[PDB]
Amino acid sequence: SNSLPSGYRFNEFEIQEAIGEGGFGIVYRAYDHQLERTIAIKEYMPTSLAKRNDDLSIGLRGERFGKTFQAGLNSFIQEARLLARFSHPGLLHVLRFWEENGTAYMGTQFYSGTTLKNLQAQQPEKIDEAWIRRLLPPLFSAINTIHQEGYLHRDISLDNIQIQESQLPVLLDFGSARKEIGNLSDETEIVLKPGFAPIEQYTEQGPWTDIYALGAVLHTLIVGSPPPVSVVRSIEDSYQPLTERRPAGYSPELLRTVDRALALKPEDRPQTIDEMAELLEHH
Ligand SMILES: Nc1ncnc2c1ncn2[C@@H]1O[C@H](COP(=O)(O)OP(=O)(O)OP(=O)(O)O)[C@@H](O)[C@H]1O
Ligand SMILES: [Mg+2]
Numbered sequence: 001s002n003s004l005p006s007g008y009r010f011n012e013f014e015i016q017e018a019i020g021e022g023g024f025g026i027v028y029r030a031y032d033h034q035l036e037r038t039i040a041i042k043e044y045m046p047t048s049l050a051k052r053n054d055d056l057s058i059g060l061r062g063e064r065f066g067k068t069f070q071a072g073l074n075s076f077i078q079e080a081r082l083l084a085r086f087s088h089p090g091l092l093h094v095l096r097f098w099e100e101n102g103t104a105y106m107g108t109q110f111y112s113g114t115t116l117k118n119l120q121a122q123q124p125e126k127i128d129e130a131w132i133r134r135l136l137p138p139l140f141s142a143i144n145t146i147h148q149e150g151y152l153h154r155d156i157s158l159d160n161i162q163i164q165e166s167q168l169p170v171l172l173d174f175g176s177a178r179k180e181i182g183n184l185s186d187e188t189e190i191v192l193k194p195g196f197a198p199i200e201q202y203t204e205q206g207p208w209t210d211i212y213a214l215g216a217v218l219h220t221l222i223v224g225s226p227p228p229v230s231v232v233r234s235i236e237d238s239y240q241p242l243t244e245r246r247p248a249g250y251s252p253e254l255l256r257t258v259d260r261a262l263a264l265k266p267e268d269r270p271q272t273i274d275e276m277a278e279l280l281e282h283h
Contacts, residue, residue, distance in 0.1 A: 002045060002052045004028065010100065013041065013107065023047050023190075024072070024178040029110060039095060042106040044076045046181055050103075057101040068184045072177040073104055079176035080106045085149060090142025092172050112165040115172075117158035120221060127221050129250050131167075136280065139169045143214065144273035146171075147207045154205070155179070156213035157196045158220060195226030199234050200266055208269045211276055215261025215269075222258065223247055233264050253283050 003018035003026050012034040019040075020027035028041045049065040049072070050058045060066055077097070084094045096107035113119075120127060139161070146153055155175035162170040182190035192201055198212035216226045219242065227239050239262065242255035257279040263269045270276035 002026070002047065004043070004056060008056065010041075010098075010105070013039070015041070024181070025076075030107070032107075038110045040108045040110045042108060043101075044073055044103045044105075044177060046072055046177070048185075048187075049181070053102075058103045068181055071184055072181045075180040076104055076106075076177040079174050080104075082151065082174070082176075086145060088142060088145050089168065090138050090170055091145060092170060111162045111170050111172075113163045115159060116161040116163050116169070116217070116221075119163050120158060124224070129254055132218065132221060132254065133280065134167060135163075135169060136277070139214070140273045140277050142169065142171050143210055147210070147273060152205060152207070153210045153213075154201065155193065156210055156217060157193045157226075158217055161217070194229045197230060198266070199230040199264060202231055204266065206266070207272050208266045211261050211269050211273070212263075212266075214276070215258050218254075218258045219262065222250055222255075227262055230264070237264055239264075251283065253280060 004015050008015040012032055014031045016029045018026055019029050024046050026043045026045050030039050030041045032039055049069045051061050053059045080094055080097050083092050093109040098105050160173040162172050179191050196213045196216040220226045241259045243252055
C-alpha cells in the first residue's frame with residue numbers, strides 16, 4: 001500500500017484508515033478534531049505515474065510523467081468543483097479541498113455502507129425486484145440533479161455508487177482524473193467502462209448516455225453481468241432482451257424498462273431520467 005498511516009495529521013484532520021486504494025487515488029476514513037466528526041479524505045494518487053516518498057509526499061516515478069500527472073491533478077480539481085456545486089443526499093458532499101504533499105485532497109462526507117459492486121458480490125440474495133424498485137427513486141433523483149444543472153456523469157457503473165446502511169445510494173466519483181490520464185497516455189482501457197458505456201461515448205451525448213449506463217447497472221444486478229460491449233452490438237447486436245430471458249422473480253415491466261434504457265441508438269432510449277422512471281409506472 002502507498003497509503004498514509006493511521007495517525008497522520010493535516011492540521012485538525014487525522015487519518016484513521018485507508019478504506020479504498022485504487023490505481024488513481026486513495027480514500028481514507030479521517031477525523032476532524034475541530035468539528036469532532038468523521039469525514040472521508042480522497043487523495044489523488046496515480047500509481048502508474050507517482051510513488052510515495054519517505055516524508056510521505058508524492059513524487060513522479062519518471063520525469064516523463066509530469067505533464068500527465070499534472071493533467072490528472074487538474075481533472076481531480078475540476079471534479080471536486082463540479083461536486084461542490086450540489087447539496088443533494090445522493091451526490092458526494094464536498095467539505096474542503098487543498099493541495100499538499102505534491103498532490104491534492106478532497107475532504108468529503110463519510111458514508112456508511114459499501115459500494116453497489118461489493119454488495120452485489122457479497123450479498124446478491126439481498127438484491128431482488130423490490131429492492132431495486134426502492135433503489136431507483138433516489139438514484140434517479142441524484143442523476144437527474146446532475147442533468148438539470150447541464151452536466152453529465154459519463155462514468156456510471158456499480159463501482160462508484162455507494163449503498164448506505166439505510167440503503168440510500170450516493171454517487172461517489174466521476175472518474176475524471178483516471179479518464180484524463182487514460183486519454184493522454186493512450187491507456188484507452190481506463191477511459192470507458194466496457195458494457196456500461198453506450199456507442200456514442202466511443203466517438204450526440206446527453207442524459208440518454210447516462211441512462212444506458214444505468215440500464216447496464218440494472219442488467220448486472222438482475223442477471224449478474226453487464227450487456228455486451230456497445231461497439232460489438234453496433235456491428236452485430238447480440239443483446240438478448242431481458243423480457244425474453246425471463247429471469248426468475250422479475251416483472252416484464254422492470255425488465256422492459258432495462259431493455260429500453262439499453263437501446264443501442266440514443267434516440268431509442270428514454271431521453272430523460274423522468275421518462276425512464278415513467279416506464280416503471282402502470283403496475
Ligand atoms: N465518502 C466516502 N465514504 C465512505 N466510503 C467511501 C467514500 N468514498 C469512497 N468510499 C469507499 O472507498 C472505496 C473505493 O474503492 P476502490 O476500489 O478505490 O478501493 P478498494 O480498496 O479496491 O476497495 P473495494 O474493495 O471496495 O474495491 C469503496 O469501498 C468505497 O465504498
Ligand atoms: Mg476496488
